[PDB]
Amino acid sequence: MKTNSEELTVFVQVVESGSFSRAAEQLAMANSAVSRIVKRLEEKLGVNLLNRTTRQLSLTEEGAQYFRRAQRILQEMAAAETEMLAVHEIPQGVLSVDSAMPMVLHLLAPLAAKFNERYPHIRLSLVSSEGYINLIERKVDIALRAGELDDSGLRARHLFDSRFRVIASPEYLAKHGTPQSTEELAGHQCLGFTEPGSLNTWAVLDAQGNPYKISPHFTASSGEILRSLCLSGCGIVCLSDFLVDNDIAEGKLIPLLAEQTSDKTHPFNAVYYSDKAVNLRLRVFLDFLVEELG
Amino acid sequence: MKTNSEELTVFVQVVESGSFSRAAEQLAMANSAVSRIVKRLEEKLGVNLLNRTTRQLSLTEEGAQYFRRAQRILQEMAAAETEMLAVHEIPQGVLSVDSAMPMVLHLLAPLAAKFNERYPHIRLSLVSSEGYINLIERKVDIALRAGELDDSGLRARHLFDSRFRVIASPEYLAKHGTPQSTEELAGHQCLGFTEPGSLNTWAVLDAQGNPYKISPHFTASSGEILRSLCLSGCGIVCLSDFLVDNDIAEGKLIPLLAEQTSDKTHPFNAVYYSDKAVNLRLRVFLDFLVEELG
Amino acid sequence: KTNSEELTVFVQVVESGSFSRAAEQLAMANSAVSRIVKRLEEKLGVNLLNRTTRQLSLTEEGAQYFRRAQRILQEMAAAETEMLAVHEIPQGVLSVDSAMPMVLHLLAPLAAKFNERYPHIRLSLVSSEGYINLIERKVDIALRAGELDDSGLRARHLFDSRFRVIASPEYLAKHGTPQSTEELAGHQCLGFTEPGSLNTWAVLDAQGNPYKISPHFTASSGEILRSLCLSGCGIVCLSDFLVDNDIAEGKLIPLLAEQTSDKTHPFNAVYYSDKAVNLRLRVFLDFLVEELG
Amino acid sequence: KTNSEELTVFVQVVESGSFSRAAEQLAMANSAVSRIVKRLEEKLGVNLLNRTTRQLSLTEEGAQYFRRAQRILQEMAAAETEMLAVHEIPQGVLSVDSAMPMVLHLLAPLAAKFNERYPHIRLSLVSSEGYINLIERKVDIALRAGELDDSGLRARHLFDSRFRVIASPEYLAKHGTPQSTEELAGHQCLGFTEPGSLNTWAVLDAQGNPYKISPHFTASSGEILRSLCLSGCGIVCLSDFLVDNDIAEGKLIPLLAEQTSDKTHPFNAVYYSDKAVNLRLRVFLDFLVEELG
């Protein structure tokens, strides 16, 4: 093990905190030092992590593959620290997590039985709103959202990456047939969101290679409603993977245009206020959360 | 034939809209004028519907059986009113429903399949919200809400009735015991709502004959969340029967305290504007909903 | 915004001959009947009737809402009768002359449930052919697929029913299943003894004409035919309620489903108006309208 | 607030026996190693040391940080090899010397997947009993239930395992299922030939001590004791990995599930520090830790 935390932290800093210059200032260090250690890291690793040929230094396929592990090492290190901190310092008090309805049902609910056995002293308070209004008002403590519009000095925590899907019920397929291409999606039944075309642009690519927009028959607000409608056989809906993965494993929803669907994932991340980070009750939950959903 | 729809409509109101007083209030009529009618309605049938022996009037054994008939008459009268309104007009356009998550997932979702085919020109918009604010602002057309705080001139069309059912998981009960008495509940995990003392007052009669008030450990802000907490062994929870009657039939959930749980039924209704009742689109959706959940 | 006071007036004017005559039965003027009838088809949003003719006619919208409006008013009376029979208990012998297959496949099953609800009515289920017993008052209420009730006596709609050509699976296995209506002429087809009246089935051919059969076996009843059919004697065609049950159990197979007519035929209890005040008769009918349809 | 150097000290100190014995394998002063563990405990604020025991014992609280600190380092070493892997396609012979049970139960089934993943590594699976040939460099790596590897030959932690007392349904039918640890005395128990060592089963008697079986049959290998158990020769106590799937198939039945101890014992790979330059080795370890961990 020729690497250390000091350069696994530093490297992970550069990526997330913009680039080289913004990380040096962030971690109370010189730029000269930030390059020295990172160039050493990629030197001793034997591979080139990031490119200087990008305007803003972007990670290579190799260096990105490292970063995801580089994160978990620092995370479950930091997490295992908290674990020990809470051994003498009793972890208690109310905690509220405003999550999207699907995330609560499929992720939070089942694992909430295990969190109770570890920390039965923490009064959990799962809630469900719409925007980041609630999270910041301290009536909600932490927000589990797949949204990268978190930049108001607030803290975000990477929970998991997860790409979209496109699926339909067996009922619908047996009667209305299957779309061979994405252009045949014009002559089928669609499932989109109530919001003004924000998520209605799917992760499937048309003959041009552009992200395929749609004309929704039904417009459900929540992601779970869409799922229950697509289960029932109201048409074809596009959602995130975790929300519908098991049903593909079951057989209740059959994927189509599997080759056309783009594979670029979107990060789901628990956002919170920086001064609430000193509270152990928040910490123990985040350190509990990111680990259970790799 | 002697009974007139006027007095049938008076009777169906007074029953499901509380007592003698609260009915006349909602129907633009005096209590002296309303009870004049209903007293005549009894004394031509030769039988006693009301029963004011107890504090609030309740239905006699015969008084309820006339209600069941009384309601359907007025229902499928309105349906044939509708059936003709959709002769020289046709149901087309965006229909924006604002329902509680429990309902859209369980009731609407598996019925959209049917509702789709019959009215394929209707663009259904399944939205969801906490308050009635949106509907007042007419950004949603119709809201399905189990709430009887709608004495606002805006119509409140009954849909169905629902008993509560205290339920747990077979993993939870077989690994934390099954409470026999209603006093043994204090030592079991009791999941409730996030709202201070609202529905956390469970409808299960204690040893004195009163609704059981619960100190909630977990506090979920939705009925559907409380289900998936309980379904995966997090504590026993009290919700409406339609939400979980299917699960307990499958055998994945267990009914708790059959005798000590109350039998009176909570009415759910689709509330909306009086002026927006003239919409053939909105009319055929409430017609569909009554004659699919009854 | 509808009401009984007007729904009753429309349900009268249709069945009560012409507009002028409807006012005579309801004990109200012709100035009244026009006001409320015109007001109903105003608040329905449709023109129900057509008064260009000397005798008012039914526009399909008016004729459909009628067969709804009727039931609403039927139910509304059934509701009242249901109460009056609380403290004025219906009792005694109520005889019900009925077509053998109606008794066996509809009544018999429901009888216990009706027994329960009104234990003091001793039913007397019987069978005859004509309307001779009923018109002579030897029976209280006749159950028929019966339009021939032109003799002043009342008729109450129970249910409309489709036809279904079928055959036993063992016959179909041993004689093959016909793919066409004209293919029937090869198979063994069973019909009624009554010359040709009912042996033009409701299964259209290439022409679009309902198929006549030349039967070799002839029973005098739908029930006997049903029994022959089940034993694999041939193909019959009967009403849906005789055989729908056996389709479920898989003892009979639907034949020529697409070629089989979708038109339905009505069933009625027929009885006397003066016998309409019979509180038990009334309750038995309300019971059947409830269970069937 | 922690760092990697102090994890890698603590994890050695614990797993490498003594406190002074770690520093001479870690290439550090006994002064410096104590400074670091005193530092680590300071910033964590929890005892990992238990100097009250002759040898340093793991604080039940600090014992958790070890198995957390152990993985971090394992992962942290996988990231590296993973990066190195992209350049060099690892090849040649890799000699793995394991116990007959580990090979037949852990490697054998996972061999397929590894084969596909690095087709140019020609695995050679052997089985010797000592660390003789590991030391002579006639084998590259040895998987053991090894808590006695302390000759400056760095050892990696594959997995922790529980014991289980189990027996054949055939045997249990013919000799009954014992409800208490004392009842074993009448049942026949099958143990190791090697004087009394693994004849102290991980199931506690009423007192609180373990049980000491007095075996009639004596097999030399936990795999033979597995085949003897299956044939219903009697009750045996082996590690969980050696029997879990037979319990999964209902071919073996678990006994005394409650009196059985929930304490785990470790299996470790054993190779030279200088042979961590291999990619063939590194990737096979990274594989074994990943699949079964």
Query: Count of CB atoms within 10 A of residue A214's CB?
Result: 20
How far apart, in whole angstroms, are the C-alpha atoms of residue A127 and residue A109?
Answer: 12
How buried is A101 (Cβ within 10 angstroms: 0-12 exposed, 13-18 middle, 19+ buried)?
buried
Per the CB < 8 Å rule, is C3 touching B8?
A: no
A229 touches chain B (CB under 8 A): yes
What are A271's strand-pairing partners?
A143
Closest to B47 (Cα-Cα) out of C72, C76, C79, C116: C79
Closest to B17 (Cα-Cα) out of B124, B144, B155, B131: B155
The dihedral sign for the CA sequence B5, B8, B13, B19: positive
D273 touches chain A (CB under 8 A): no
Distance from CA of B180 to the nearest CA of C (A): 36
User: For residues B82 and B284, is the Cβ–Cβ distance under 8 A?
Assistant: yes
Residue for token pair 């077979």:
B170
How far apart, in whole angstroms, are the C-alpha atoms of residue D45 and residue A84?
Answer: 8
Instruction: Kindly give the pairing relationship between strand A266-272 and strand A142-145.
Output: antiparallel
Per the CB < 8 Å rule, is A218 touching B105?
A: no
My answer on whether B116 and B158 are in the same domain is yes
Q: Which residues contact C61 (CB under 8 A, 6 or more apart)?
A: B84, B87, C46, C47, C48
Per the CB < 8 Å rule, is D65 touching A80?
A: yes
My answer on whether A110 and A96 are in the same domain is yes
How far apart, in whole angstroms, are the C-alpha atoms of residue C136 and residue C156?
Answer: 19
Per the CB < 8 Å rule, is D45 touching A84?
A: yes
- Chain C contact set for B76 (CB, 8 A): 68, 71-72
Q: What six digits make up the tokens of D211? A: 């049980």
Residue for token pair 């009914």:
B255
Residue for token pair 């490297």:
A11
Taking every pair of C-alpha atoms in chain D, what is the biggest distance, in angstroms?
63
My answer on whether A269 and A134 are in the same domain is yes
CATH number reported for the structural domain that contains residue A127 in this entry: 3.40.190.10
Q: Which of D87, D104, D128 is the last residue of a domain?
A: D87
How far apart, in whole angstroms, are the C-alpha atoms of residue C123 and residue C108?
Answer: 11
User: For residues D56 and D19, is the Cβ–Cβ distance under 8 A?
Assistant: yes
Structure's resolution in angstroms? 3.2
Residue of C65, C78, C79 with shortest CB distance to B83: C65
Per the CB < 8 Å rule, is D46 touching A3?
A: no
**H/E element, C243:** helix C240-249
- Chain B contact set for C72 (CB, 8 A): 73, 76-77, 80
- Chain D contact set for A2 (CB, 8 A): 80
Q: Which residues contact A71 (CB under 8 A, 6 or more apart)?
A: A12, A158
My answer on whether A61 and A190 are in the same domain is no
What are B267's strand-pairing partners?
B161
Residue of D45, D72, D84 with shortest CB distance to A76: D72
How far apart, in whole angstroms, are the C-alpha atoms of residue B17 and residue A94?
Answer: 39
Per the CB < 8 Å rule, is C79 touching B62?
A: no
The dihedral sign for the CA sequence A209, A211, A217, A223: positive
Degrees to nearest 5, angle at CA B44 with B67 and C111: 60
Taking every pair of C-alpha atoms in chain C, what is the biggest distance, in angstroms?
70
My answer on whether A153 and A283 are in the same domain is yes
User: For residues D70 and D157, is the Cβ–Cβ distance under 8 A?
Assistant: yes
**Do chains A and B meet with 3 or more Cβ pairs nearer than 8 Å?**
yes
- Chain D contact set for A81 (CB, 8 A): 1-2, 44
End-to-end CA distance of chain D: 27
My answer on whether A43 and A180 are in the same domain is no
C122 touches chain B (CB under 8 A): no
Amino acid letter, residue C193: T
Degrees to nearest 5, angle at CA C207 with C203 and C213: 45
User: For residues A10 and A30, is the Cβ–Cβ distance under 8 A?
Assistant: no
Closest to C201 (Cα-Cα) out of C249, C234, C158: C234
How far apart, in whole angstroms, are the C-alpha atoms of residue C238 and residue C230?
Answer: 12
My answer on whether A242 and A176 are in the same domain is yes
Residues 147-206 of chain D with CB under 8 A from chain A are: none
**Do chains D and C meet with 3 or more Cβ pairs nearer than 8 Å?**
no
A73 touches chain D (CB under 8 A): yes
A121: helix, coil or strand? coil
Residue for token pair 């108006």:
C273
Closest to D275 (Cα-Cα) out of D103, D142, D160, D87: D142
B87 touches chain C (CB under 8 A): yes
D36: helix, coil or strand? helix
Instruction: Name the residue range of residue C92's domain.
Output: 88-162+264-293
My answer on whether A2 and A61 are in the same domain is yes
> What count of Cα atoms within 13 Å lies in the side-chain half-sphere of residue B100?
18
How far apart, in whole angstroms, are the C-alpha atoms of residue B160 and residue B162?
Answer: 7
How far apart, in whole angstroms, are the C-alpha atoms of residue B8 and residue D137?
Answer: 98
Closest to A233 (Cα-Cα) out of A217, A249, A246: A217
My answer on whether C221 and C78 are in the same domain is no
Burial D126-137 (b: 16+ CB within 10 A, else e): eeeeebeebeee
How far apart, in whole angstroms, are the C-alpha atoms of residue B246 and residue B53?
Answer: 37
Per-residue CA distances from B247 to B174, C123, C263 (Å): 17, 43, 42
Instruction: Kindly give the pairing relationship between strand A218-220 and strand A190-193.
Output: parallel
Q: What is the DSSP letter of C98?
A: B
How far apart, in whole angstroms, are the C-alpha atoms of residue B208 and residue C235?
Answer: 69
Q: What six digits make up the tokens of D23? A: 């520093």
CATH number reported for the structural domain that contains residue A80 in this entry: 1.10.10.10
User: For residues D252 and D229, is the Cβ–Cβ distance under 8 A?
Assistant: yes
User: For residues B111 and B119, is the Cβ–Cβ distance under 8 A?
Assistant: no
Give the residue from D8, D41, D80, D277 with the most A CB atoms within 10 Å of its CB, the best one to mutate.
Answer: D80
- Chain A contact set for D1 (CB, 8 A): 81
Q: Return the percent helix, strand and coil in chain C, to nearest 5.
A: 45, 20, 35
Per the CB < 8 Å rule, is B84 touching C46?
A: yes
My answer on whether A104 and A149 are in the same domain is yes
Burial B140-169 (b: 16+ CB within 10 A, else e): bbbbbbbebebeeebbbbbbbebebbbbbb
A151: helix, coil or strand? coil
My answer on whether A68 and A84 are in the same domain is yes
What are D96's strand-pairing partners?
D125, D141
What are B99's strand-pairing partners?
B144
What are D218's strand-pairing partners?
D191
What ranges make up the beta strands (E) of C168-281? 191-192, 200-204, 210-212, 218-219, 235-239, 253-254, 264-271
Q: Which residues contact D198 (CB under 8 A, 6 or more apart)?
A: D191, D192
How buried is A286 (Cβ within 10 angstroms: 0-12 exposed, 13-18 middle, 19+ buried)?
buried
How far apart, in whole angstroms, are the C-alpha atoms of residue C203 and residue C180?
Answer: 10
Q: What six digits make up the tokens of C187? A: 């198979």
C50: helix, coil or strand? strand
Q: How many CB pairs under 8 A join A and D?
A: 78
User: For residues C270 and C134, is the Cβ–Cβ distance under 8 A?
Assistant: yes
User: Which DSSP string do the residues of chain B spell out, in sequence order?
Assistant: ----HHHHHHHHHHHHTSSHHHHHHHTT--HHHHHHHHHHHHHHHTS----TTSSS----HHHHHHHHHHHHHHHHHHHHHHHHHTTSS---EEEEEEE-HHHIIIIIHHHHHHHHHH-TTEEEEEE--SSSHHHHTTSSSEEEE------SSSEEEEEEEE-EEEEE-HHHHHHH----SSSGGGGS-EEEESSTTSS-EEEEE-TTSSEEE---SSEESSHHHHHHHHTTSS-EEEEEHHHHHHHHHHTSSEE--TTTB----EEEEEEE-SGGGG-HHHHHHHHHHHTT--
Q: Write phi, then psi, for B164 (nearest 5 degrees).
A: -80, 160
Give the residue from A8, A59, A62, A87 with the most D CB atoms within 10 Å of its CB, the best one to mutate.
Answer: A87
What are D123's strand-pairing partners?
D94
As a dihedral over the C-alpha atoms of residue A127, residue A130, residue A136, residue A142, rounded to 10 degrees, the angle is 40
Total domains in the fold of chain D: 3
Q: Which of B21, B56, B88 is the last residue of a domain?
A: B88
> What count of Cα atoms within 13 Å lies in the side-chain half-sphere of residue A229?
32
My answer on whether A234 and A273 are in the same domain is no
Nearest CA in chain C to B69: C79
How far apart, in whole angstroms, are the C-alpha atoms of residue C119 and residue C121?
Answer: 6
> What count of Cα atoms within 13 Å lies in the side-chain half-sphere of residue A203?
20
User: For residues C145 and C239, is the Cβ–Cβ distance under 8 A?
Assistant: yes
